[PDB]
Amino acid sequence: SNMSLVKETVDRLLKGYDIRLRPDFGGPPVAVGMNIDIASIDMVSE
Amino acid sequence: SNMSLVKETVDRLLKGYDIRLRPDFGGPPVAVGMNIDIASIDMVSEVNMDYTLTMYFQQAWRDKRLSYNVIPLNLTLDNRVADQLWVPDTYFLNDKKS
Amino acid sequence: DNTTVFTRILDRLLDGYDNRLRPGLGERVTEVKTDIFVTSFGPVSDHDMEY
Amino acid sequence: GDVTVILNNLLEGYDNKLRPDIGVKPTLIHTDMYVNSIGPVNAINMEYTIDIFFAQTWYDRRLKFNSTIKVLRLNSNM
Numbered sequence: 024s025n026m027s028l029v030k031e032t033v034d035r036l037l038k039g040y041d042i043r044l045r046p047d048f049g050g051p052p053v054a055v056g057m058n059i060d061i062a063s064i065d066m067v068s069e
Numbered sequence: 070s071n072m073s074l075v076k077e078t079v080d081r082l083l084k085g086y087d088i089r090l091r092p093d094f095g096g097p098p099v100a101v102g103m104n105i106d107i108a109s110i111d112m113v114s115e116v117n118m119d120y121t122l123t124m125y126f127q128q129a130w131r132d133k134r135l136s137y138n139v140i141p142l143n144l145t146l147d148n149r150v151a152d153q154l155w156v157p158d159t160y161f162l163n164d165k166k167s
Numbered sequence: 168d169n170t171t172v173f174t175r176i177l178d179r180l181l182d183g184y185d186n187r188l189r190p191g192l193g194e195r196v197t198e199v200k201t202d203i204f205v206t207s208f209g210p211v212s213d214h215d216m217e218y
Numbered sequence: 219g220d221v222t223v224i225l226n227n228l229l230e231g232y233d234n235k236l237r238p239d240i241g242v243k244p245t246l247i248h249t250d251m252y253v254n255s256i257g258p259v260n261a262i263n264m265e266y267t268i269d270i271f272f273a274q275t276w277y278d279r280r281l282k283f284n285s286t287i288k289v290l291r292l293n294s295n296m
């Protein structure tokens with residue numbers, strides 16, 4: 024079943040994962056790409 | 070070192086401590102003294118029929134469970150340890166927002 | 168993969184640490200050096216007497 | 219009683235991070251709404267208030283159980 028594969032994979036990926044350290048903690052910087060989808064601009068108050 | 074003894078004392082105090090039980094749970098009532106330092110009376114609204122006040126609200130009581138005789142000095146602790154201690158369930162009846 | 172070394176430094180630092188005792192609790196005063204960068208001084212409300 | 223062991227068996231080895239049929243087929247969700255009140259219409263802020271009971275139904279075969287009981291009726295706790 025694909026459920027067992029996905030569960031094993033997700034358990035392995037989160038096996039011993041340190042949230043305190045970023046990707047490439049001591050190495051080069053990580054590049055973050057940003058998208059924005061503006062749904063509304065509500066109230067422009069003077 | 071001194072900090073090691075203080076840490077040992079605090080760990081001894083808080084191990085086996087039941088926060089669900091008041092001090093003297095099956096005995097005489099615990100006396101709680103209150104004192105207040107009023108810092109502001111801000112808005113006195115006739116529309117809402119209320120007033121806002123800011124205060125330092127201090128409650129003092131005795132808990133024999135939290136007694137220690139090794140360290141001779143008073144212990145100011147990180148405020149989060151309040152979550153691990155019993156505190157009286159004081160409320161304000163005429164309070165609307167706090 | 169040098170992330171495990173830093174992970175070990177981090178978990179060894181907190182090994183035996185007690186965040187309920189200020190540093191120097193029985194020995195000295197803890198000195199806190201402070202500074203402020205005001206990114207924006209907001210509006211003033213003379214009605215509420217606040218800023 | 220027996221509902222406790224049913225609930226314990228349903229949640230053993232259960233990963234709530236994965237939708238049912240996560241790599242097989244899409245999850246089909248039937249939706250119902252009951253409108254208790256369509257509140258005030260604010261025309262200066264271009265909005266209206268509405269209170270509803272929102273109901274969602276789907277199938278999770280990890281939650282399948284064989285018992286004399288036909289339906290477990292639970293509060294928010296689970």
Ligand SMILES: *[C@@H]1O[C@H](CO)[C@@H](O[C@@H]2O[C@H](CO)[C@@H](O[C@@H]3O[C@H](CO)[C@@H](O)[C@H](O)[C@@H]3O)[C@H](O)[C@H]2NC(C)=O)[C@H](O)[C@H]1NC(C)=O
Nearest residue numbers: 087088089148149150151152153154155156157158159167
């Ligand atoms: C209403 O008041 C009570 C008590 O003043 C609040 O309960 C306290 O809630 C905080 C945060 O949810 C608890 O801290 C948490 O501790 C756990 C470890 O037990 C930690 O994993 C969390 O990260 C967090 O630090 C605190 O223990 C808890 N104290 C008591 C005595 O229950 C409650 O949150 C207040 N409710 C609201 C809506 O403000």
Ligand SMILES: *[C@@H]1O[C@H](CO)[C@@H](O)[C@H](O)[C@H]1NC(C)=O
Nearest residue numbers: 129139140141142143144145
């Ligand atoms: C602890 O506080 C009390 C009251 O504030 C004071 O009388 C006492 O001397 C203090 N103890 C020490 C060791 O400073």
